[PDB]
Amino acid sequence: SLTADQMVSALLDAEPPILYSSMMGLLTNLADRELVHMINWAKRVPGFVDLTLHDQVHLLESAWLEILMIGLVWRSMEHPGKLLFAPNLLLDRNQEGMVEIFDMLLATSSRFRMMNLQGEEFVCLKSIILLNSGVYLEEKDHIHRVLDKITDTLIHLMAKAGLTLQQQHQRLAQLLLILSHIRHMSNKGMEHLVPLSDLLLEMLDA
Amino acid sequence: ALSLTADQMVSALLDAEPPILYSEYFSEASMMGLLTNLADRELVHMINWAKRVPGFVDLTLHDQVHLLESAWLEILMIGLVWRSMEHPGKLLFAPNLLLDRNQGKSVEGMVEIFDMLLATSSRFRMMNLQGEEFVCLKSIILLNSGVYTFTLKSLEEKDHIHRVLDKITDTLIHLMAKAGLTLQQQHQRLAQLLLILSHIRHMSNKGMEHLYLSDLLLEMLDAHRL
Numbered sequence: 001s002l003t004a005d006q007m008v009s010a011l012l013d014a015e016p017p018i019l020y021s022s023m024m025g026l027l028t029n030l031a032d033r034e035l036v037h038m039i040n041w042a043k044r045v046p047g048f049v050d051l052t053l054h055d056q057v058h059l060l061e062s063a064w065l066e067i068l069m070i071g072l073v074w075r076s077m078e079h080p081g082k083l084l085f086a087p088n089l090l091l092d093r094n095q096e097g098m099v100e101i102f103d104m105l106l107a108t109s110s111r112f113r114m115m116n117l118q119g120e121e122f123v124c125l126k127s128i129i130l131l132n133s134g135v136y137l138e139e140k141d142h143i144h145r146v147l148d149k150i151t152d153t154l155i156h157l158m159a160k161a162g163l164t165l166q167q168q169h170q171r172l173a174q175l176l177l178i179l180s181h182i183r184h185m186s187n188k189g190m191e192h193l194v195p196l197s198d199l200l201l202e203m204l205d206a
Numbered sequence: 207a208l209s210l211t212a213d214q215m216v217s218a219l220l221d222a223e224p225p226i227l228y229s230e231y232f233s234e235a236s237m238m239g240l241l242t243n244l245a246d247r248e249l250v251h252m253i254n255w256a257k258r259v260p261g262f263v264d265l266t267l268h269d270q271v272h273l274l275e276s277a278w279l280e281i282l283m284i285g286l287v288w289r290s291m292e293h294p295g296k297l298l299f300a301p302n303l304l305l306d307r308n309q310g311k312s313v314e315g316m317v318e319i320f321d322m323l324l325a326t327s328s329r330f331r332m333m334n335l336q337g338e339e340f341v342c343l344k345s346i347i348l349l350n351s352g353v354y355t356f357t358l359k360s361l362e363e364k365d366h367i368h369r370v371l372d373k374i375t376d377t378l379i380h381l382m383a384k385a386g387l388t389l390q391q392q393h394q395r396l397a398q399l400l401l402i403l404s405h406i407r408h409m410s411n412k413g414m415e416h417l418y419l420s421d422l423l424l425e426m427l428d429a430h431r432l
């Protein structure tokens with residue numbers, strides 16, 4: 001029942017902190033620590049906690065790598081040709097099978113830069129990833145109605161910025177098509193890299 | 207291409223549609239050979255269809271090749287899902303090759319992809335996906351799948367592709383408006399359809415893993431004018 005502005009404000013307030021950092025060990029440890037904060041972010045995405053825990057976990061399990069990637073790309077926008085894994089861990093291209101994903105992450109930053117992706121748009125995109133990556137009756141209906149609400153909210157953000165109706169639906173499409181590439185990176189990422197579900201369940205107990 | 211009305215975009219895409227091909231005129235042991243032969247014959251028609259997607263032949267040959275290398279499996283899959291939409295629980299690879307889940311169980315890792323395709327077909331069925339929407343979505347896959355994995359020329363190329371993608375977005379919205387959808391419903395349905403493309407990409411990546419081109423794409427795309 002939230003308004004678009006209340007949706008945006010809830011997502012903005014829910015943003016996780018930027019954590020700080022042998023290379024792969026460090027990146028794995030950073031990712032593991034960010035995942036905890038991801039869980040607490042997800043609990044604040046409006047609509048998420050109305051799902052069963054089993055469904056909260058399947059969605060997090062499907063989405064977590066995409067969410068880490070889009071977060072990395074978002075905080076890397078202002079660092080052309082580099083990835084800001086942490087404020088103390090800025091890596092460029094020159095830093096097997098890694099450069100291919102690195103280039104794909106860099107291409108995403110470049111796309112966000114070309115689009116001038118806004119922060120309010122970023123948090124909507126992350127929320128969509130959370131609710132969408134695992135959707136493939138009543139529980140899915142609810143997921144789709146929350147997803148619909150985020151679509152309403154993105155359009156509202158674009159109207160408030162003064163875009164024409166045409167530009168609104170063009171930009172909405174451009175943003176959602178980026179999510180196909182983020183999925184693609186996640187799949188390649190998974191290839192390149194106790195069930196995670198048990199870990200996610202434990203994390204939900206704080 | 208950038209001057210087409212939405213109705214002219216729909217018309218060009220509908221006319222460009224490839225034919226529905228058949229399998230040879232069956233067994234678990236011969237099934238993969240039949241599916242591979244079907245895909246190979248469909249790929250030829252794909253190329254011809256791509257050349258008829260407005261704006262596609264404005265690109266360099268190298269970029270046309272790149273886009274089709276990136277998108278061909280997704281395009282085969284979305285075509286399959288569309289043909290299968292009115293056959294619940296089954297995949298209509300061809301009019302004479304309608305397969306159920308159990309026929310996939312015979313090949314390792316096959317049923318997982320089969321189930322994802324079935325769920326996409328069920329989702330299109332639930333949304334009552336229209337043929338005019340389908341051809342827009344397939345044209346989006348062609349132009350979008352490879353656009354993040356490509357000089358001043360390259361920048362011009364990418365800008366062109368995004369302008370054509372934008373025109374197909376306008377066309378999708380025009381279609382939904384003509385169908386009587388409120389403006390909220392139009393934006394929502396647009397988003398729902400585009401998010402399914404994320405899942406089609408997911409299936410393609412899993413499918414490529416399971417299945418395990420360029421100069422062949424070249425030879426059909428690099429036609430002479432004789």
Ligand SMILES: CCCN1CC(COc2ccc([C@@H]3c4ccc(O)cc4CC4(CC4)N3C(=O)c3ccccc3)cc2)C1
Nearest residue numbers: 027028030031032034035068069071072098099101102189
């Ligand atoms: C819960 C126990 C299981 N864990 C053990 C499991 C390790 O998973 C992970 C391990 C490492 C990472 C890093 C990471 C860290 C933080 C970040 O914000 C973003 C990323 C990006 C990411 C692309 C994915 N990555 C890489 O190194 C990378 C590789 C190739 C090219 C470029 C980058 C993410 C996930 C998960």
Ligand SMILES: CCCN1CC(COc2ccc([C@@H]3c4ccc(O)cc4CC4(CC4)N3C(=O)c3ccccc3)cc2)C1
Nearest residue numbers: 241242244245246282283286316319320413416417419422
């Ligand atoms: C020079 C080009 C090389 N060739 C490229 C040639 C192999 O690629 C292909 C080989 C087979 C296929 C079939 C096929 C055929 C027609 C169709 O419309 C759709 C599909 C769907 C598809 C999912 C992809 N598939 C499967 O069997 C399948 C597997 C697991 C679950 C479900 C189905 C597609 C592509 C070798």
